[PDB]
Amino acid sequence: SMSYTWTGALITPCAAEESKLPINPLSNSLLRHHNMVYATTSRSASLRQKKVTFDRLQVLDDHYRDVLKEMKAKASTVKAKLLSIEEACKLTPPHSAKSKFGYGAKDVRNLSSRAVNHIRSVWEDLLEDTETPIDTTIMAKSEVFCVQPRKPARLIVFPDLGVRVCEKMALYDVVSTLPQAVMGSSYGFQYSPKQRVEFLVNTWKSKKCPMGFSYDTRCFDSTVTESDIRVEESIYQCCDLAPEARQAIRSLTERLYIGGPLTNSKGQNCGYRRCRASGVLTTSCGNTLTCYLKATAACRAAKLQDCTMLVNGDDLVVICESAGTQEDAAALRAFTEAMTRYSAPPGDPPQPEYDLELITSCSSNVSVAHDASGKRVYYLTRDPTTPLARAAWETARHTPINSWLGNIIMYAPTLWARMILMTHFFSILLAQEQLEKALDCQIYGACYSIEPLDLPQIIERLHGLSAFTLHSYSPGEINRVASCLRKLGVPPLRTWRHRARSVRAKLLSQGGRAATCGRYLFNWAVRTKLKLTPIPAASQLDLSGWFVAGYSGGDIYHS
Ligand SMILES: CC(C)C[C@@]1(C(=O)O)C[C@H](c2cnccn2)[C@H](c2nccs2)N1C(=O)c1ccc(C(C)(C)C)cc1
Numbered sequence: 001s002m003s004y005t006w007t008g009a010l011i012t013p014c015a016a017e018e019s020k021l022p023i024n025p026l027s028n029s030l031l032r033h034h035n036m037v038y039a040t041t042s043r044s045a046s047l048r049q050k051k052v053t054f055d056r057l058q059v060l061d062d063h064y065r066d067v068l069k070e071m072k073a074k075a076s077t078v079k080a081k082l083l084s085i086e087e088a089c090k091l092t093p094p095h096s097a098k099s100k101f102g103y104g105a106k107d108v109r110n111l112s113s114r115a116v117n118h119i120r121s122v123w124e125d126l127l128e129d130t131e132t133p134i135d136t137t138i139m140a141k142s143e144v145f146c147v148q149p150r151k152p153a154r155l156i157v158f159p160d161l162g163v164r165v166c167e168k169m170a171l172y173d174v175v176s177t178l179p180q181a182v183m184g185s186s187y188g189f190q191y192s193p194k195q196r197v198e199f200l201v202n203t204w205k206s207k208k209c210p211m212g213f214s215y216d217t218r219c220f221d222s223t224v225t226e227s228d229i230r231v232e233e234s235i236y237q238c239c240d241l242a243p244e245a246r247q248a249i250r251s252l253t254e255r256l257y258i259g260g261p262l263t264n265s266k267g268q269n270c271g272y273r274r275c276r277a278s279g280v281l282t283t284s285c286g287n288t289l290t291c292y293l294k295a296t297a298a299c300r301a302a303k304l305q306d307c308t309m310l311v312n313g314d315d316l317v318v319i320c321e322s323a324g325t326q327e328d329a330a331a332l333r334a335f336t337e338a339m340t341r342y343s344a345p346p347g348d349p350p351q352p353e354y355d356l357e358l359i360t361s362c363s364s365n366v367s368v369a370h371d372a373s374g375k376r377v378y379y380l381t382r383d384p385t386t387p388l389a390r391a392a393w394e395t396a397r398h399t400p401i402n403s404w405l406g407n408i409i410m411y412a413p414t415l416w417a418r419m420i421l422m423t424h425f426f427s428i429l430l431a432q433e434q435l436e437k438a439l440d441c442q443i444y445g446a447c448y449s450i451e452p453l454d455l456p457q458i459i460e461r462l463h464g465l466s467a468f469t470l471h472s473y474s475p476g477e478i479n480r481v482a483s484c485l486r487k488l489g490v491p492p493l494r495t496w497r498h499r500a501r502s503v504r505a506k507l508l509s510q511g512g513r514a515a516t517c518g519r520y521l522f523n524w525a526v527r528t529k530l531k532l533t534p535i536p537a538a539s540q541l542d543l544s545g546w547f548v549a550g551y552s553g554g555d556i557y558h559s
Contacts, residue, residue: 001274020034020038022034030424031388037144037147040142041142045140067300071293072235083169091558122165130251133259134163138155139264140153157278159256159277166252171248174239183309189549192463201378204319210319210354212352215350216346223345230253232282261273283552295339298336298339302331303334317362381416387404387421391403402440405425410462413467419493423499425452460538462543468520501525505518
């Protein structure tokens with residue numbers, strides 16, 4: 001069937017849309033070619049709709065069915081709990097889109113009567129009505145990128161706030177627990193960056209002759225069929241479940257997940273969806289389960305040997321045993337034809353790699369650096385172009401989410417995050433005296449409230465101590481970074497070093513947590529380095545639940 005059906009009414013914005021980077025002193029000292037940075041808007045929506053609208057092809061075979069059964073068997077060991085109204089309300093982001101029924105995120109979090117009452121009515125309706133399609137809003141996503149030597153806006157689809165609270169009650173424990181039980185070590189969202197690098201490296205070193213590749217499914221969400229969504233539900237139904245939870249999952253699957261009507265911000269009927277909605281609780285879990293099922297079965301069909309998967313929603317990387325250059329090329333092609341039959345056609349044809357570092361998964365690649373003792377240490381990095389563009393954008397315009405904070409945290413060991421992101425943002429936070437003001441950022445889709453002064457502890461936990469002492473980065477990594485800076489008009493690294501020295505001094509002056517940042521975050525700036533020892537508060541702070549599962553589009557806020 002058609003992934004989408006359009007009525008002709010437009011995908012509209014509910015406010016003016018900024019698309020260009022402003023000329024601002026604060027952002028200009030970081031990136032001067034401001035005209036190369038842009039934000040996607042509703043104006044490019046039709047170009048996206050055209051690409052995601054097509055008739056799906058799907059042929060399932062024995063390998064597919066065999067793999068499904070194996071996954072269901074594992075799912076059978078799971079017992080998921082129904083979340084209470086209070087618990088579900090506490091998981092709602094403070095700025096989550098308000099309901100059209102007289103209440104918003106604040107009311108939900110405060111458990112106001114109007115909100116709590118409407119949520120119950122929505123829940124009771126999910127138990128009684130098993131068929132009526134639930135309404136959804138479709139908006140053009142606003143994302144920042146650097147012009148190419150332009151990307152049309154992605155489309156987000158989500159139901160009303162009331163429905164989202166009910167999704168949590170019925171499925172939060174499931175999508176946070178079942179993926180791991182089913183896919184095990186292959187479930188990407190259970191790993192912190194350090195653990196992910198470790199899994200990649202170990203998996204690669206465990207093969208007698210490693211060969212790996214990333215597989216880019218063309219517009220994954222639109223390739224998800226009705227059958228895929230029901231197969232997904234069949235996996236959830238293997239869990240021990242409260243009666244109402246079971247009915248809720250059954251109703252939600254038929255009324256929301258398999259598809260439904262699309263309404264624009266103006267309240268007009270845009271058309272119909274018969275594929276994955278980006279903005280529902282099960283999207284990350286569902287996509288991970290679906291991608292893993294299709295890939296695992298595809299490997300068998302292509303005759304790939306000892307395929308080890310690493311899946312994060314639609315992002316997939318495979319590491320297996322090589323059988324020769326030609327043999328691998330052919331088997332990879334067979335794998336791709338198998339995925340296409342399962343309705344997971346490639347965006348760009350996959351390529352076999354015999355160098356772990358030449359593989360990009362989750363927009364990142366493994367690279368090598370050395371700690372204080374000169375010992376080799378693996379870490380995850382990526383082209384810094386988009387992160388830097390977004391950092392500049394977030395510097396000139398105040399944004400709800402701070403991808404720069406999320407990037408410092410997730411890419412702390414990288415050359416670019418330490419010398420550029422840390423230096424730039426800490427100098428500004430100093431000037432504005434806001435080092436202790438908590439900010440919002442996202443990690444694996446979940447919203448987090450973090451204070452800049454806690455970065456040191458946070459980084460030690462997610463990356464270890466070497467994150468503050470890495471040096472002697474690889475030439476490729478250094479050249480990619482330098483090249484990127486020249487392209488964007490970002491001052492050269494030597495300039496950042498000079499700026500960091502000044503930032504570190506001011507930080508040490510204020511002593512306290514500020515000084516801790518100066519010592520750990522900028523130890524790379526001073527030639528006479530300071531002996532760095534484990535941070536006291538580091539091995540204490542509660543970081544549990546930080547890397548358990550993905551919730552991209554799931555409207556989740558971890559408190
Ligand atoms: C600002 C950023 C930190 C937040 C973000 C997310 O909330 O999902 C979006 C980002 C982003 C950036 N550009 C395009 C798309 N998304 C990247 C991604 N999310 C999914 C795939 S890449 N990511 C991560 O959390 C993330 C960062 C590093 C790693 C590792 C180093 C551990 C791989 C893993 C996840």
